[PDB]
Amino acid sequence: DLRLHLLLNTSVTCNDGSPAGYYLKESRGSRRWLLFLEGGWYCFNRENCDSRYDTMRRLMSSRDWPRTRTGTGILSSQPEENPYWWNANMVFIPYCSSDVWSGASSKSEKNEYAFMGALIIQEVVRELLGRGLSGAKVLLLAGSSAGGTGVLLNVDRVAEQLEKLGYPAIQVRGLADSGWFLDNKQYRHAPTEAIRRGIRYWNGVVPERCRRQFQEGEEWNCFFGYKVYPTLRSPVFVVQWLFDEAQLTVDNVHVQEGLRLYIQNLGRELRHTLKDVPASFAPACLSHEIIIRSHWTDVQVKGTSLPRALHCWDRSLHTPLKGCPVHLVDSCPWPHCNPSCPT
Ligand SMILES: O=C(O)CSc1ncnc2c(C3CC3)c(Cl)sc12
Ligand SMILES: *[C@@H]1O[C@H](CO)[C@@H](O)[C@H](O)[C@H]1NC(C)=O
């Protein structure tokens, strides 16, 4: 079990002004720290956020959070479930800001909701430095779905924060799961518009180099992995199903020739965007997240599981390693052409 800590700085809040927080399980024998960002879509105006508050309130408030959570998948402390980092210090950061982890805006007399995702990550890191993180050798910022996009938006800011606080020895790395989306044309006629509205509603922030490329009004581009990734300095391992269900949902895909060609082209486009991503794991499966599922060990690309690829990535961050690959992208063109895809 990971134990809840609400932030001591209670001005860093969930959407409704309740304190944000994190769940922690320490491993005093370990200098590895895994901080995982939960996902769960986002909301982008008063009306859609009010709807989310009625029926997805745990994603907007800490008032009903449980005192503990069980770590699963990459957050598991059992080596059988987590061959990769079972002995690490484990941190689960609940997603309660509805802003893809990008916001820096308080609730106020002008704002019904607070969107503080980027500040929640910063404050979690700051408070963890007093609970052991100051001794870390590696901080892996991981996340799934909106949390995976959150890794992309925030990993270099975590690295800068630790440098400025006087901890240049902590190596900050990112693991972005299911957060690598394409701003493609829908199958029937969108992503970009809702992100553009969201960033304005949230006061959303993006990494500085990407901001400087795209400039004002165009920062929505930095929410798309293939555009933001090249601007990042921290090592980032990208996990993405080639036929991700959330990508298909935004594309209005729910099989005749036009749809067959659409799906094949989507997989080819995704594979193309990962060609120059050296640490990546991209199986040809129709599915959603990977990394906190208890059976995350089961899928393989070219005979290599994700926990193995991640271990190979760790070794590479000590020339390619014999039998220990880190770039694992399926080339077969249709969902479940890889026999290890989830059931
Ligand atoms: O959290 C979850 O379960 C899914 S989050 C999600 N789903 C679909 N598209 C996106 C985007 C881009 C607009 C394309 C983000 Cl940027 S985040 C996200
Ligand atoms: C609490 O967090 C806010 C937002 O980051 C910050 O402005 C303020 O300095 C913090 N308070 C303390 C006491 O550090």
**Pocket flag, ligand 1, residue 37 (CB < 6 Å):** no
Task: Bin 335: left if φ > 0, else alpha if -120 < ψ < 50, else beta.
Answer: beta
Ligand nearest to the CA of 121: 2
Q: Which residues contact 248 (CB under 8 A, 6 or more apart)?
A: 254, 266, 286
Report CA 118 to chain centroid distance, whole Å: 13
What whole-number distance in Å separates Cα of residue 335 and Cα of residue 343?
Answer: 12
Ligand 1 centroid from CA 165, angstroms: 32
- Alpha-carbon distance 232 to 251, whole Å? 27
Ligand 1 proximity of 40 Cβ (cutoff 6 Å): yes
Our answer on whether the CB atom of 206 is closer than 6 Å to any ligand 1 atom is no
Beta carbon of 17 within 6 Å of any ligand 1 atom: no
Q: What residue type is 189 in one-letter code?
A: H
**Distance from Cα 322 to the centre of ligand 1, integer Å:** 36
Instruction: State whether the beta carbon of 9 lies less than 6 angstroms from ligand 2.
Output: yes
Choose one of 10, 12, 116, 121 to mutate for the ligand 2 pocket test, by most ligand atoms within 8 angstroms of C-beta: 12
Write down the experimental method used for this entry. X-ray
CB 234 near ligand 2, within 6 Å: no
Q: Measured at the alpha carbon of residue 151, what is the angle toward residues 254 and 78, in degrees to the nearest 5? A: 90
Nearest CA to 254 among 290, 283, 289, 286? 286
Q: Which amino acid is at 151?
A: V
- Give the tokens for residue 337: 């052409």
CB 7 within 8 A of CB 49: no
Which residue of 100, 201, 247 sits with most ligand 1 atoms within 8 Å of its CB, as the best mutation to test the pocket?
Answer: 100
CA nearest ligand 2 atom 12, residue: 9
Q: Which residues are catalytic?
A: 145, 244, 288
Q: Is 287 in the pocket of ligand 1 (CB under 6 A)?
A: no
**Beta-strand pair 300-301/304-305:** antiparallel
**Ligand 2 pocket check for 119: Cβ under 6 Å:** yes
Task: Specify whether the CB–CB gap between 36 and 23 falls below 8 A.
Answer: no
Per-residue HEC secondary structure of the chain comes to CEEEEECCCCCCECCCCCECEEEEECCCCCCEEEEEECCCCCCCCHHHHHHHHHHCHHHCCCCCCCCEECCCHHHCCCCCCCCCCCCCEEEEECCCCCCCCCCCECCECCECCCECHHHHHHHHHHHHHCCCHHHCCEEEEEEECHHHHHHHHHHHHHHHHHHHHCCCCCEEEEEEECCCCCCCCCCCCCHHHHHHHHHHHHCCCCCHHHHHHHCCCCHHHHHCHHHHHHHCCCCEEEECCCEEHHHHHHCCCCCCHHHHHHHHHHHHHHHHHCCCCCCEEECCCEECCCCCCCCCCCCEECCEEHHHHHHHHHHHCCCCCCCCCCEEECCCCCCCCCCCCCC
**Nearest-atom index, ligand 1, CA of 41:** 1
| Resolution in angstrom units | 1.4
Residues 6+ apart with CB under 8 A from 197: 44, 45
Q: How far is the CA of 13 from the centre of ligand 2 (A)?
A: 11
Chain mean position to CA 258: 32
Kindly give the distance from the C-alpha atom of residue 29 to the centroid of ligand 1, in angstroms, as a whole number.
Answer: 36
Phi and psi of 112, rounded to 5°? -65, -35
